[PDB]
Design a binder for this molecule. Structure first.
Ligand SMILES: *[C@@H]1O[C@H](CO)[C@@H](O[C@@H]2O[C@H](CO)[C@@H](O[C@@H]3O[C@H](CO[C@H]4O[C@H](CO[C@H]5O[C@H](CO)[C@@H](O)[C@H](O)[C@@H]5O)[C@@H](O)[C@H](O[C@H]5O[C@H](CO)[C@@H](O)[C@H](O)[C@@H]5O)[C@@H]4O)[C@@H](O)[C@H](O[C@H]4O[C@H](CO)[C@@H](O)[C@H](O)[C@@H]4O[C@H]4O[C@H](CO)[C@@H](O)[C@H](O)[C@@H]4O[C@H]4O[C@H](CO)[C@@H](O)[C@H](O)[C@@H]4O)[C@@H]3O)[C@H](O)[C@H]2NC(C)=O)[C@H](O)[C@H]1NC(C)=O
Ligand SMILES: *[C@@H]1O[C@H](CO)[C@@H](O[C@@H]2O[C@H](CO)[C@@H](O)[C@H](O)[C@H]2NC(C)=O)[C@H](O)[C@H]1NC(C)=O
Ligand SMILES: *[C@@H]1O[C@H](CO)[C@@H](O[C@@H]2O[C@H](CO)[C@@H](O)[C@H](O)[C@H]2NC(C)=O)[C@H](O)[C@H]1NC(C)=O
Ligand SMILES: *[C@@H]1O[C@H](CO)[C@@H](O[C@@H]2O[C@H](CO)[C@@H](O)[C@H](O)[C@H]2NC(C)=O)[C@H](O)[C@H]1NC(C)=O
Ligand SMILES: *[C@@H]1O[C@H](CO)[C@@H](O[C@@H]2O[C@H](CO)[C@@H](O)[C@H](O)[C@H]2NC(C)=O)[C@H](O)[C@H]1NC(C)=O
Ligand SMILES: *[C@@H]1O[C@H](CO)[C@@H](O)[C@H](O)[C@H]1NC(C)=O
Ligand SMILES: *[C@@H]1O[C@H](CO)[C@@H](O)[C@H](O)[C@H]1NC(C)=O
Lengths: 130, 48, 105, 48
């Protein structure tokens, strides 16, 4: 299910920044959809994921000003960036992950934690701010 | 400090072995409280 | 990014700076510049189908052992940066992706 | 008086304070000087 991303690559600073992502192959109902942005000079920075109850979690280092709306009509996962700074130039990556579970003690007490693994990744679309 | 995951203490008792050993108690409790009575156990009420 | 220089043939063992504080579920990623990252192994040893059956992770047992990854049988084209994603019971949600690892031959 | 802080906090579970990380002042060696020590206490042994 190679995802295709349609990014403009040219967004004026302090404006709206939207990046779409196709799914391709199969629908999106039992998969977790994450979004990772990598900026020059550093590594990738996980943003968040959306699935299940439609309550997408956001990174605590982004002020939660970004939103990840998952669509089902056209099967795309866009990004709505508001109040973006002129230093947001970074290539965005569209990939999904499966939520495994790790258990270390009695699971009835609550001794387990959820970890996500990115099974598939998209080539991404490089988008800057000008 | 604690070296590793922070888990909770707990005791384990067999569900079947406790179940049959608690039906032997209720059979003798019927020798002092009437052969035909409903005997129910409950958890401790209060105190230290 | 961090510097790690290797050569052809000899096996290489690479770990990540972050240290566990419980039961870990580390995963390793391959960020070849340009192409999308590929998951090498999750759950400390559970590589997905397609990845060559020569990258092996450290199993989680007898807490204390460092999470190191072996890339034995290195090839000439291995010039990417790796990523050790550490999940542990205590540290909570692992939002960060850790430090990269440049590969040079 | 101990300055206790939850060992886990935003670490796991509902932020339960089953364990507290309490730092306090005590006179180590000389009776004038007192240095800051700490220890792990259970929630059953510290009263706010
Ligand atoms: C009082 O009673 C209560 C209630 O009975 C007791 O509470 C229980 O206590 C025990 C002990 O603390 C807990 O055990 C933990 O279980 C977890 C989870 O195990 C389950 O899930 C595993 C994975 O499931 C996934 O895959 C399967 C397909 O394989 C899939 O169907 C599933 O949906 C899911 O996707 C299963 O593999 C596992 O099977 C095991 O148990 C079977 C019997 O049930 C047995 O027949 C199997 O052969 C197998 O042994 C089970 O279904 C365990 O993960 C955990 O152990 C891991 O974590 C500890 C923490 O350090 C670590 O030391 C262990 O080595 C082990 O870590 C290995 O596995 C990790 C997960 O795969 C992996 O990430 C690690 O890297 C590591 O892998 C390496 O080591 C293993 C070890 O040999 C090796 O096999 C690998 O190949 C590799 O080398 C705990 O054991 C119970 O959860 C808990 N509650 C219940 C309800 O049981 C309490 O203990 C009692 N107390 C007293 C005092 O009596
Ligand atoms: C309590 O622990 C003992 C061992 O310390 C357990 O005895 C084992 O029971 C299993 C049955 O599932 C046998 O296969 C083993 O051979 C037994 N081991 C020994 C050393 O006797 C016992 O099952 C445990 N009971 C509970 C309720 O946890
Ligand atoms: C015994 O069990 C009962 C119920 O299983 C517990 O009753 C609770 O008591 C608290 C008061 O502290 C009430 O607020 C709850 O509403 C009660 N629960 C129910 C279901 O009625 C009781 O706390 C338990 N006591 C012990 C010592 O185990
Ligand atoms: C309990 O709190 C103390 C602080 O009083 C912690 O000690 C610090 O731990 C950090 C991280 O390991 C170190 O960088 C500091 O140097 C430590 N300071 C001192 C004075 O020891 C301790 O780690 C805490 N323990 C637990 C289990 O949370
Ligand atoms: C332990 O004692 C030190 C002082 O020796 C306390 O630190 C002082 O805290 C007061 C709080 O009003 C400050 O005004 C002082 O400037 C502090 N002195 C320092 C930091 O050298 C500390 O709070 C005590 N800790 C306890 C009692 O748990
Ligand atoms: C086993 O437990 C059930 C309820 O949990 C009880 O009705 C039954 O009588 C028990 N069996 C014996 C043999 O005591
Ligand atoms: C059983 O019931 C009879 C009722 O006839 C009663 O007399 C007796 O005390 C009860 N308990 C026994 C027989 O152990």
């Amino acid at each position: 299910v190679q995802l295709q991303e349609s990014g403009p690559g040219l967004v004026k600073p302090s404006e709206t920044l939207s990046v779409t992502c196709s799914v391709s192959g199969d629908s999106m109902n039992n998969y977790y959809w994450t979004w990772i942005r990598q900026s020059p000079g550093k590594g990738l920075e996980w943003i968040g994921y959306i699935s299940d109850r439609e309550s997408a979690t956001y990174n605590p280092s982004l002020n939660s000003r970004v939103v990840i709306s998952r669509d089902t009509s056209k099967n795309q996962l866009s990004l709505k960036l508001n109040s973006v700074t002129p230093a947001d130039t970074a290539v965005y990556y569209c990939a999904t992950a499966r939520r495994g579970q790790r258990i270390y003690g009695v699971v009835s007490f609550g001794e387990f934690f959820y970890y996500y693994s990115m099974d598939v990744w998209g080539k991404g679309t490089t988008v800057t701010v000008s | 400090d604690i070296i590793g995951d922070i888990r909770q203490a707990h005791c384990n008792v067999s569900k079947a072995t406790w179940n049959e050993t608690l039906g032997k108690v209720v059979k003798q409790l019927r020798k002092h409280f009437g052969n035909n009575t409903i005997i129910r156990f409950a958890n401790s009420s209060g105190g230290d | 990014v961090r510097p790690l220089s290797v050569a052809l043939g000899e096996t290489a063992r690479i770990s990540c700076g972050r240290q566990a504080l419980g039961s870990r579920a580390v995963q390793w990623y391959q960020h070849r510049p340009g192409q999308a990252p590929i998951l090498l192994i999750y759950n400390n040893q559970d590589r997905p189908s397609g990845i060559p059956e020569r990258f092996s992770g450290t199993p989680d047992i007898n807490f204390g052992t460092r999470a190191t990854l072996t890339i034995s049988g290195v090839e000439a084209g291995d010039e990417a940066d790796y990523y050790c994603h550490m999940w542990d019971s205590r540290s909570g949600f692992s939002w960060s992706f850790g430090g990269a690892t440049r590969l040079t031959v | 008086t101990l300055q206790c802080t939850n060992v886990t906090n935003n670490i796991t579970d509902d932020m339960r304070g089953e364990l507290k990380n309490c730092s306090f002042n005590m006179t180590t060696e000389l009776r004038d000087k007192k240095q800051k020590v700490y220890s792990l206490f259970y929630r059953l042994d510290v009263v706010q």
